[PDB]
Write a protein that holds these residues in place. Structure first.
Motif, PDB file in Angstrom:
ATOM      1  N   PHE A  86     -38.274  43.195  16.886  1.00  0.00           N
ATOM      2  CA  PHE A  86     -37.716  41.842  16.812  1.00  0.00           C
ATOM      3  C   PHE A  86     -38.511  40.912  15.881  1.00  0.00           C
ATOM      4  CE2 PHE A  86     -35.579  42.426  21.196  1.00  0.00           C
ATOM      5  CZ  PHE A  86     -34.482  43.009  20.574  1.00  0.00           C
ATOM      6  N   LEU A  87     -39.840  40.928  15.987  1.00  0.00           N
ATOM      7  CA  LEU A  87     -40.705  40.123  15.119  1.00  0.00           C
ATOM      8  C   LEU A  87     -40.526  40.466  13.652  1.00  0.00           C
ATOM      9  CD1 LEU A  87     -44.015  40.213  17.117  1.00  0.00           C
ATOM     10  CD2 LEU A  87     -42.290  38.379  16.944  1.00  0.00           C
ATOM     11  N   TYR A  88     -40.187  41.719  13.388  1.00  0.00           N
ATOM     12  CA  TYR A  88     -39.867  42.137  12.041  1.00  0.00           C
ATOM     13  C   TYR A  88     -38.527  41.506  11.677  1.00  0.00           C
ATOM     14  CZ  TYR A  88     -39.336  45.315   8.045  1.00  0.00           C
ATOM     15  OH  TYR A  88     -39.170  45.853   6.776  1.00  0.00           O
ATOM     16  N   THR A 109     -43.939  39.380   9.803  1.00  0.00           N
ATOM     17  CA  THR A 109     -43.401  38.357   8.909  1.00  0.00           C
ATOM     18  C   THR A 109     -43.090  37.034   9.610  1.00  0.00           C
ATOM     19  OG1 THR A 109     -41.514  37.759   7.498  1.00  0.00           O
ATOM     20  CG2 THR A 109     -41.145  39.431   9.193  1.00  0.00           C
ATOM     21  N   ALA A 110     -43.003  35.965   8.822  1.00  0.00           N
ATOM     22  CA  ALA A 110     -42.615  34.644   9.318  1.00  0.00           C
ATOM     23  C   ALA A 110     -43.759  33.819   9.909  1.00  0.00           C
ATOM     24  CB  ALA A 110     -41.475  34.766  10.320  1.00  0.00           C
ATOM     25  N   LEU A 111     -44.983  34.293   9.688  1.00  0.00           N
ATOM     26  CA  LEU A 111     -46.176  33.551  10.069  1.00  0.00           C
ATOM     27  C   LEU A 111     -46.150  33.313  11.572  1.00  0.00           C
ATOM     28  CD1 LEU A 111     -47.742  30.331   8.582  1.00  0.00           C
ATOM     29  CD2 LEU A 111     -48.729  32.307   9.761  1.00  0.00           C
ATOM     30  N   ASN A 112     -46.270  32.080  12.035  1.00  0.00           N
ATOM     31  CA  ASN A 112     -46.284  31.833  13.474  1.00  0.00           C
ATOM     32  C   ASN A 112     -44.927  31.510  14.109  1.00  0.00           C
ATOM     33  OD1 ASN A 112     -46.148  29.588  11.976  1.00  0.00           O
ATOM     34  ND2 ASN A 112     -47.908  28.551  12.898  1.00  0.00           N
ATOM     35  N   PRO A 113     -44.202  32.551  14.470  1.00  0.00           N
ATOM     36  CA  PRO A 113     -42.803  32.515  14.913  1.00  0.00           C
ATOM     37  C   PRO A 113     -42.656  31.854  16.280  1.00  0.00           C
ATOM     38  CG  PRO A 113     -43.725  34.681  15.301  1.00  0.00           C
ATOM     39  CD  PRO A 113     -44.794  33.896  14.592  1.00  0.00           C
ATOM     40  N   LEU A 132     -50.287  32.852  19.718  1.00  0.00           N
ATOM     41  CA  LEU A 132     -51.118  32.170  20.696  1.00  0.00           C
ATOM     42  C   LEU A 132     -50.759  32.669  22.090  1.00  0.00           C
ATOM     43  CD1 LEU A 132     -51.827  29.621  22.747  1.00  0.00           C
ATOM     44  CD2 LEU A 132     -53.361  30.278  20.867  1.00  0.00           C
ATOM     45  N   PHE A 133     -49.465  32.643  22.394  1.00  0.00           N
ATOM     46  CA  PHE A 133     -48.973  33.071  23.698  1.00  0.00           C
ATOM     47  C   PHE A 133     -49.473  34.469  24.053  1.00  0.00           C
ATOM     48  CE2 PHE A 133     -45.541  35.307  26.074  1.00  0.00           C
ATOM     49  CZ  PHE A 133     -45.710  34.682  27.289  1.00  0.00           C
ATOM     50  N   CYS A 134     -49.075  35.470  23.273  1.00  0.00           N
ATOM     51  CA  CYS A 134     -49.519  36.850  23.483  1.00  0.00           C
ATOM     52  C   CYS A 134     -51.043  36.988  23.489  1.00  0.00           C
ATOM     53  CB  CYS A 134     -48.915  37.767  22.427  1.00  0.00           C
ATOM     54  SG  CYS A 134     -47.107  37.746  22.405  1.00  0.00           S
ATOM     55  N   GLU A 135     -51.719  36.188  22.666  1.00  0.00           N
ATOM     56  CA  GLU A 135     -53.178  36.136  22.693  1.00  0.00           C
ATOM     57  C   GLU A 135     -53.640  35.801  24.100  1.00  0.00           C
ATOM     58  OE1 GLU A 135     -55.191  36.350  19.680  1.00  0.00           O
ATOM     59  OE2 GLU A 135     -56.962  36.488  20.972  1.00  0.00           O
ATOM     60  N   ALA A 136     -52.874  34.958  24.789  1.00  0.00           N
ATOM     61  CA  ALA A 136     -53.356  34.389  26.045  1.00  0.00           C
ATOM     62  C   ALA A 136     -52.652  34.816  27.330  1.00  0.00           C
ATOM     63  CB  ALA A 136     -53.360  32.872  25.954  1.00  0.00           C
ATOM     64  N   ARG A 137     -51.421  34.358  27.522  1.00  0.00           N
ATOM     65  CA  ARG A 137     -50.762  34.435  28.823  1.00  0.00           C
ATOM     66  C   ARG A 137     -50.444  35.859  29.307  1.00  0.00           C
ATOM     67  NH1 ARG A 137     -49.443  29.123  29.126  1.00  0.00           N
ATOM     68  NH2 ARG A 137     -51.159  28.022  28.064  1.00  0.00           N
ATOM     69  N   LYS A 156     -55.152  31.443  12.464  1.00  0.00           N
ATOM     70  CA  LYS A 156     -55.156  30.719  11.193  1.00  0.00           C
ATOM     71  C   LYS A 156     -54.528  31.567  10.100  1.00  0.00           C
ATOM     72  CE  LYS A 156     -59.326  28.719  10.179  1.00  0.00           C
ATOM     73  NZ  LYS A 156     -60.093  27.774   9.301  1.00  0.00           N
ATOM     74  N   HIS A 157     -54.962  32.819   9.992  1.00  0.00           N
ATOM     75  CA  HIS A 157     -54.603  33.619   8.827  1.00  0.00           C
ATOM     76  C   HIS A 157     -53.649  34.808   9.060  1.00  0.00           C
ATOM     77  CE1 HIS A 157     -58.332  31.448   7.520  1.00  0.00           C
ATOM     78  NE2 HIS A 157     -57.561  31.236   6.469  1.00  0.00           N
ATOM     79  N   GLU A 158     -53.993  35.768   9.924  1.00  0.00           N
ATOM     80  CA  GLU A 158     -53.193  37.004   9.962  1.00  0.00           C
ATOM     81  C   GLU A 158     -51.813  36.773  10.593  1.00  0.00           C
ATOM     82  OE1 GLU A 158     -54.971  41.366   9.209  1.00  0.00           O
ATOM     83  OE2 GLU A 158     -55.326  40.575  11.228  1.00  0.00           O
ATOM     84  N   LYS A 159     -50.769  37.222   9.902  1.00  0.00           N
ATOM     85  CA  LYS A 159     -49.398  36.992  10.353  1.00  0.00           C
ATOM     86  C   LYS A 159     -48.847  38.021  11.348  1.00  0.00           C
ATOM     87  CE  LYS A 159     -48.175  34.512   6.120  1.00  0.00           C
ATOM     88  NZ  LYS A 159     -49.175  34.947   5.106  1.00  0.00           N
ATOM     89  N   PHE A 160     -49.346  37.988  12.581  1.00  0.00           N
ATOM     90  CA  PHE A 160     -48.745  38.735  13.687  1.00  0.00           C
ATOM     91  C   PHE A 160     -48.611  40.251  13.442  1.00  0.00           C
ATOM     92  CE2 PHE A 160     -46.104  36.944  17.446  1.00  0.00           C
ATOM     93  CZ  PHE A 160     -46.868  37.699  18.315  1.00  0.00           C
ATOM     94  N   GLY A 161     -47.415  40.791  13.680  1.00  0.00           N
ATOM     95  CA  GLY A 161     -47.135  42.210  13.528  1.00  0.00           C
ATOM     96  C   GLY A 161     -47.367  43.047  14.775  1.00  0.00           C
ATOM     97  N   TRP A 162     -47.036  44.333  14.682  1.00  0.00           N
ATOM     98  CA  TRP A 162     -47.171  45.263  15.791  1.00  0.00           C
ATOM     99  C   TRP A 162     -48.614  45.420  16.232  1.00  0.00           C
ATOM    100  CZ3 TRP A 162     -49.983  49.695  16.452  1.00  0.00           C
ATOM    101  CH2 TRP A 162     -49.812  50.342  17.680  1.00  0.00           C
ATOM    102  N   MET A 163     -49.548  45.491  15.293  1.00  0.00           N
ATOM    103  CA  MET A 163     -50.933  45.705  15.678  1.00  0.00           C
ATOM    104  C   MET A 163     -51.431  44.495  16.466  1.00  0.00           C
ATOM    105  SD  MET A 163     -54.480  46.331  13.636  1.00  0.00           S
ATOM    106  CE  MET A 163     -55.696  47.562  14.128  1.00  0.00           C
ATOM    107  N   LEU A 164     -51.027  43.292  16.054  1.00  0.00           N
ATOM    108  CA  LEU A 164     -51.460  42.069  16.747  1.00  0.00           C
ATOM    109  C   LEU A 164     -50.835  41.974  18.147  1.00  0.00           C
ATOM    110  CD1 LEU A 164     -53.423  39.816  16.361  1.00  0.00           C
ATOM    111  CD2 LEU A 164     -52.711  40.396  13.961  1.00  0.00           C
TER     112      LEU A 164
END
Length: 393
Positions: free
Chosen positions: A137-139, A151-155, A164-169, A225-233
């Motif tokens: 979906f993020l793709y 893609t799409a930076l911070n969707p 941020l969300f996935c980083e946290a919650r 700030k920099h890396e645009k998400f993706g499957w690895m993130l």
């Protein structure tokens, strides 16, 4: 090339370790035997409706919370472009809330103190599938591996920022919950919560609590700030973090040894020295950078006034090495792993991992501040040569 194979390679490694710790005795299994490999890998759990439902309920509980948590709102980064994103952020209230609710379902008997240990194996695969569909979906919202880096930076949907969300919650709070469940499971199987479980479970709890008290701070990190998400993130968020950070408690669930009080004293001291350094350095940077004139360790502050309008503290922890804080964090890591003692290599594969991570992070940050501070940075690297350790490295 390296990326699609790394992509297919990662989920097994989590299974391998999980299988290892849970079904074996946390020993590093490796044979060449065919039958041995079938016995090893048969232990992988298929995706159950009660698990997919439970996770989906949890993930949406956290997304719900993230969206309607009370406040405040902050501006986010990216000074050029402007290019200044809004961030409603209630990590504290959320955290407390989902605790009260989760513990509440537990006393109401509606949920079991041990679900996250019991239905674990199926969760691992459920989340494994959910991140793949997700990364798909993020793709899709925004050219062969772009699945990897996205893609799409911070969707966003509805003011909900996903990195941020996935980083946290749904990632990190699940971590503490698992730990609690595994604590609970050690008590059901052995009659006491052993002291190494209390070290590990408490230490990670407090680290997390500390993380949320500084929820704002992670708005400046490379991931954000920099890396645009993706499957690895996304996969690093939903899968790697909970299902490998919980390894110590996993191990302990069927390792009911105690430690001698000197080990207790050294481990706790390690953890608190680590917190003094990790949190100390950051506070010191800040409290200096809001009032340079102020004292820092008695002496008037020594700073370098970088041409590009910023100050570099050359005193306190920042005078001792360029990255005392990373060292702080690493001490903290080692302090989680040492309760597990020396039965098995598995609990310690974090400090190996974290070490490599920090090494990479350091190099990156170094480069960044050369791109930004030029000669002043070099002057700084002249003043404070040691990257982390600092007498060693």
């Amino acid at each position: 090339f390296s990326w699609l194979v790394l992509m297919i390679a990662l989920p097994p490694l989590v299974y391998y370790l999980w299988i290892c710790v849970t079904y074996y005795q946390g020993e590093l299994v490796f044979t060449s035997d065919a039958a041995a490999w079938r016995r090893f890998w048969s232990h992988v759990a298929p995706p159950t409706w009660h698990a997919a439902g439970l996770y989906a309920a949890w993930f949406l509980g956290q997304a719900a919370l993230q969206v309607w948590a009370p406040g405040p709102t902050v501006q986010g980064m990216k000074l050029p472009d402007g290019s200044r994103l809004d961030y409603r952020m209630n990590g504290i209230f959320s955290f407390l809330f989902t605790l009260a609710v989760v513990f509440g379902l537990v006393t109401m008997g509606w949920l079991d103190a041990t679900v996250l240990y019991d239905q674990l194996g199926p969760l691992l695969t459920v989340v494994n599938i959910f991140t793949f569909v997700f990364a798909g979906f993020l793709y899709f919202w925004g050219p062969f591996y772009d699945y990897f880096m996205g893609t799409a930076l911070n969707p966003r949907i509805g003011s909900l920022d996903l990195k941020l969300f996935c980083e946290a919650r749904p990632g990190m709070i699940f971590w503490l919950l698992m730990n609690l469940s595994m604590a609970a499971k050690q008590y059901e199987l052995h009659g006491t919560v052993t002291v190494p479980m209390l070290l590990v479970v408490g230490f990670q709890s407090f680290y997390l609590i500390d993380y949320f008290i500084h929820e704002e701070a992670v708005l400046t990190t490379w991931d954000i700030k920099h890396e645009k998400f993706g499957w690895m993130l996304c996969w690093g968020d939903l899968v790697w973090l909970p299902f490998t950070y919980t390894l110590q408690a996993q191990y302990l669930v069927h390792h009911t040894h105690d430690l001698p009080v000197w080990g207790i004293i050294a481990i706790v001291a390690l953890n608190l020295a680590g917190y003094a350094i990790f949190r100390g350095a950051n506070i010191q940077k800040h409290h200096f950078r809001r009032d340079p004139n102020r004292i820092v360790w008695g002496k008037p502050a020594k700073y370098i006034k970088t041409k590009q309008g910023s100050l570099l503290l050359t005193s306190g922890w920042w005078g001792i090495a360029r990255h005392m804080n990373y060292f702080g964090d690493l001490m903290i890591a080692l302090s989680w792993c040492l309760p597990a003692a020396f039965g098995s290599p598995i609990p310690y594969f974090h400090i190996v991992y974290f070490t490599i991570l920090l090494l990479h992070r350091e190099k990156r940050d170094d480069a960044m501040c050369l791109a930004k501070y030029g000669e002043d940075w070099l002057q700084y690297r002249k003043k404070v040569p040691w990257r982390i350790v600092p007498k060693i490295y």
